[PDB]
Structures are given as structure tokens and as C-alpha cells.
Amino acid sequence: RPFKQRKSLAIRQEEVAGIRAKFPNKIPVVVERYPRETFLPPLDKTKFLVPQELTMTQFLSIIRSRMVLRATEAFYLLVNNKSLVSMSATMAEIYRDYKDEDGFVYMTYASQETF
């Protein structure tokens, strides 16, 4: 259930617009499951609204918070499902660098993936 297919581009834009208008300080994020994934538990929430002072490291933890896992096993958070980015980078950097056409930033969580 990928978001880019669920919602048409114009709709996604409308959403991004209304919400960036609603919260002009926060980045809009779409975290999805790696479709090749079967091991990890699904993520109940799909859309995240994050501050700019937030780091990837913190966001990953927040995403982890929504899932019940053995306190040890980590997973990878791919931006655009193709970019392994700096753990230290802020949401703002990731936003400016990897902004999708519709204004969202798209992420994908995977326990393992091969390219």
C-alpha cells in the first residue's frame, strides 16, 4: 500500500499545501514498508509531521516507537527507497535534498534490502 499510488499527484499536493499552511514550521514525511519486506511488523501510521531541528537518528527512534520489537534488532530507513543518508542530518537538509515532486519526503523501512 504505497502512498504515491493511493493518492493522485494533485491530491497529494493539495494535502501538502494545506498542511504546510497549517504547520509552516514542520516537514511532511511519508514512511512506508519496503514491499519486499516480510520480517518486520507493519507500521500503523503512514504520515509524519516533523520539526526541522530533528535528526534522522531521532526520527528512526520515533518510527521504532510505533512498532513492537525485540529491543535490539534495528532496521534501515531508506529515503526515496534508494538513499542511505547521514544519521546526523536534520530533517531540513533531507527535505531540501530529497523533496519529492509533490512536496513530501518519502522514506522506506527495511530489515534488509539488496540493490
Binding site: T46, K47, P51, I62
Partner: peptide, 9 residues
């Protein structure tokens, strides 16, 4: 359910 998770600070 297609709705936002609002995080802050």
C-alpha cells in the same frame, strides 16, 4: 488510516 503523526521539539 491516512492521518498525520504530529511530533514536536
Amino acid at each position: 488510516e491516512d492521518e498525520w503523526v504530529n511530533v514536536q521539539y
